[PDB]
Amino acid sequence: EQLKMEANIDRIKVSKAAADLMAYCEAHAKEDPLLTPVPASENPFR
Amino acid sequence: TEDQRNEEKAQREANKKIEKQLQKDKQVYRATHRLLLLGADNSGKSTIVKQMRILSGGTSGIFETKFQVDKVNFHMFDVGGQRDERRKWIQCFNDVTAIIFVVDSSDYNRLQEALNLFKSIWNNRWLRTISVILFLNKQDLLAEKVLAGKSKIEDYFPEFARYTTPEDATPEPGEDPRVTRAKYFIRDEFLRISTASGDGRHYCYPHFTCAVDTENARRIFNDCRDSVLARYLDEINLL
Amino acid sequence: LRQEAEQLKNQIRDARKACADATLSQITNNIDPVGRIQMRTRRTLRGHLAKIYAMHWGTDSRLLVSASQDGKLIIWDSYTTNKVHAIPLRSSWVMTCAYAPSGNYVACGGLDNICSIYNLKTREGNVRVSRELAGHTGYLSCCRFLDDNQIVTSSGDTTCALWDIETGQQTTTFTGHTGDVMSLSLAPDTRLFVSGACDASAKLWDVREGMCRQTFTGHESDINAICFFPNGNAFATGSDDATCRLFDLRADQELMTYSHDNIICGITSVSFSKSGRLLLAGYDDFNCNVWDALKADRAGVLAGHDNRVSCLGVTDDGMAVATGSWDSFLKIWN
Amino acid sequence: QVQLQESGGGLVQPGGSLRLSCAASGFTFSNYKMNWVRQAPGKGLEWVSDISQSGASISYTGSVKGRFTISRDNAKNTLYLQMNSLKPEDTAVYYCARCPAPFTRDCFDVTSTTYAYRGQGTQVTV
Amino acid sequence: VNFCLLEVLIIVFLTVLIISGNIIVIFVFHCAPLLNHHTTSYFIQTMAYADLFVGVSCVVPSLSLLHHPLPVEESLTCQIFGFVVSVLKSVSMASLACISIDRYIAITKPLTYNTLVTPWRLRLCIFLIWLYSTLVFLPSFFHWGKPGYHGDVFQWCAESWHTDSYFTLFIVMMLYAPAALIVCFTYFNIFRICQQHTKDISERQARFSMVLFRITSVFYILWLPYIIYFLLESSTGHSNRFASFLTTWLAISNSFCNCVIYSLSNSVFQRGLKRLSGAMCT
């Protein structure tokens, strides 16, 4: 049951996963509002 | 534009009407006292529900009971339909006025489970504030089941033999001393858990409750008085 | 047997461990720090009677819903600080709320074990309940909208369920868990979702088949909140063991822990930023903390509450971060 | 991954003294508080023994209070329940129950049938 | 004013610190959200408004001491100044009274508290405080004596004006002595209840083997020699000059003292002060 349920799925490389996570953080970093703070009128809470 | 001004005026009217409705419900929520009922099943939750129904509502899952005494209304929540584990939905009962706790007096084997339940209530991080009313239910059947004999408390609780009666209110148990030593041991055994730790911010209010005890809603009333009054006496020094 | 299969799974996990040479912060040590991230209460939506226990944002990232155990369901406006509606509720005990991407409907998961679904934009303009989804026996911990019509609902009867509203029956049942399933987050691609339970484990389910695709058991206690990584290959878990952890699907192995010895209270809520550098964790020691996701360092504190932080929600665009607590006060943060 | 296996137990002579162990892995053993819970046939679950995170404070159920003993070895990461002067009704399945939270005096371990942090259990016989 | 400082320095040092404490307590009450959850902290906000206004009034005679820039006849101009303080300090006085009644309600019928102290009756209490504090001392406008010895450096009241003792007796039997009676009655019953409760709870615990009063006591000991010496100099018509001026300034000092004492008294106010200081330092 659990053996056939978990057995089939592949285990990809952790270094590849860390590189992918780093790329996913870096690519959308320019439009990141809290990571890169906004202009005071552009920040709609202001 | 003028339409933006109209939208802002509409939002102002809506927030004013909603704040008016919430301000009207604030007083009725603050006035009414909420009461968690907890306990085992053989401990007569249902019979004391029937006594407050001596004194529609959603019976799906939780049961509700309304009763008012002396122009103060208590609304009292029985957690019926919920599953047995209680580590998480007992966090939801934080701001309640008092945790009523009901114990079957007669059968000594589940008393240890009730004691562990009380200890779990007392030391919980979110339940440390709340005063715990204590009820010891079916008090007559305890007396019959000890006076019939052949059922040793001593086997379950060995510290009963090295125990004596400290004090009592005598005429009600005036037929017998050994039932007095029994029931007052049960009180003392809960109160060892109660006075175990803390800073005196929540208190245990035990009552020896029979099946036929009519006015015991008023005992709930007066010890809600004691809990709220002690809360206010701490509130003087707190602010 | 089953124990030999568990040893085989430990062998495959050790193979993934051999694939895992160094830590992610060890890998991204060439990338420099995020830096300090201060924040301030840009607005303070006050107006609840009792403890705010869960909130949800809108997909406009402008309107939001909060729910408290007084029996009020309040739609706040973040920009004007005005409450659009305040639905009075039949039962007071409410453990979650959810807000449709279409914006028409609001869900109210309660401890009465009935989910309620409300329509906001009604023809008459007076707000009533549309339907009452009733198939659960335990309390309802979390619920989220799959679409406008499909809704996923976790509960304390250890089973999730996927529902359609006008039909009124459980389309799919999700029964793998042993502990009470208490958090869930759903992916942006929406065909797969995740759920953590009180048994220190997260299952990820395909929403069509309704079966546990993957199981992760890194944690040590109850798991209070879970959240997908934005680009969809990972998720973070906030759990009562006072540790937070980042888990991956493709590697099928946990990557990152988020722990400091001085803080001891359990994580209550968790959320991500849009970019995913910036992880946000509510807490019982009264202050939200905010972590660099890829260095596991405490970037900052967002402390403005007097009681435990129940709920924590980031906007879609990623500017504002709403937070509620048991002090009945909801606050919008940067 | 959390891990609990019991060891020891089975049949012994009725007056005998029987030693049991519980191994715990996947967490810091130090901060949690341990319980033993026994299941007699045709019964519900019952809490039997309690010991804190420190091991300085300790508590016993009333029946086997003067009779049995419980010990923790946090550095060795093991739990032990020794039975002394056994009595024939005490035969049961002896689960090792881990408390849910750390740094926490209260627990809600003894439940209906299901619980995350119980061990699988071993059965002792008089 | 070549050597005016040897008497004016007390007034300057009092007034600056009084306004500073008022502003600090005002901001501390405003920033903390759950401070307003209690009913009493509304009255501390009332004291804070009275404290800021009393500090502004103190700043007025300070500017009179050297500059005299405004219309400086002071036959009425300084005179009505005394009216202000005779209202405003007494406003703070009546604040204590209604607070005591508040806590007395919370001791007497403690469940029905929230039905008898509605906030509408709370705004009615605050409006009757300001109205009555105006209304008692108003006939100082009507040429029948002034109730204050504040700002006695004003030489016009030092020479022309004399106390009418019937006016003095009417105002002390009208406003001062009801405040004293109400406060003593409330704290008599409150410490009765509190000590009775304390011994019972400790006896139950051993059987299984008042910052509002501090604020009140500070205010009453600080205002006590002013009323006593006020009655004396009303009674005989004999002045002790430096004693009268020091007594009046010390009576003024209570509004300065209350904010700092409440700062030390509540650690929740200390936490609000810590959060506000971390914000204002940033």
Residue numbers in the entry:
A (entry chain G): 17 to 62
B (entry chain A): 9 to 63, 201 to 384
C (entry chain B): 7 to 340
D (entry chain N): 1 to 126
E (entry chain R): 25 to 233, 252 to 324
Task: Reproduce, without paraphrasing, sentences from the article in which this PDB structure was first reported.
GPR21 is a class-A orphan G protein-coupled receptor (GPCR) and a potential therapeutic target for type 2 diabetes and other metabolic disorders. This receptor shows high basal activity in coupling to multiple G proteins in the absence of any known endogenous agonist or synthetic ligand. Here, we present the structures of ligand-free human GPR21 bound to heterotrimeric miniGs and miniG15 proteins, respectively. We identified an agonist-like motif in extracellular loop 2 (ECL2) that occupies the orthosteric pocket and promotes receptor activation.
To improve the low surface expression of the wild type GPR21 protein, we used a fusion approach, with thermostabilized apocytochrome b562RIL (BRIL) attached to the receptor N terminus (Wild type GPR21 with BRIL, GPR21(wt)). The stable GPR21(wt)-G protein complex was formed by mixing purified GPR21(wt) with the mini-Gα (mGα), Gβγ and the camelid antibody Nb3518 in vitro. Size-exclusion chromatography (SEC) and SDS-PAGE analysis reveal that purified GPR21(wt) protein can form a monodispersed complex with mGs or mG15 in the absence of an agonist. We finally determined the cryo-EM structures of GPR21(wt)-mGs and GPR21(wt)-mG15 complexes with nominal global maps at 3.3 Å and 3.8 Å resolution, respectively. Some side chains were trimmed in the two models during model building since the map-model correspondence would be incomplete at some regions owing to the relatively low resolution. The overall structures of this mutant (GPR21(m5)-G protein) complexes largely overlap with those of the GPR21(wt)-G protein complexes with the receptor conformation nearly identical (root-mean-square deviation (r.m.s.d) between GPR21(m5) and GPR21(wt): 0.68 Å for Gs-bound and 0.90 Å for G15-bound structures). The overall topology of the two types of G protein-bound GPR21 complex structures resemble each other, and the two G protein binding interfaces largely overlap on GPR21. We found the relative positions between GPR21 and G proteins were similar in the two complexes. Both structures share an overall conserved G protein binding interface mainly consisting of the TM3 and TM5–TM7 of GPR21 and the Gα subunit of the G protein heterotrimers. We hypothesize that such a non-canonical mechanism through flexible TM6 may provide GPR21 with the ability of coupling to multiple G proteins.
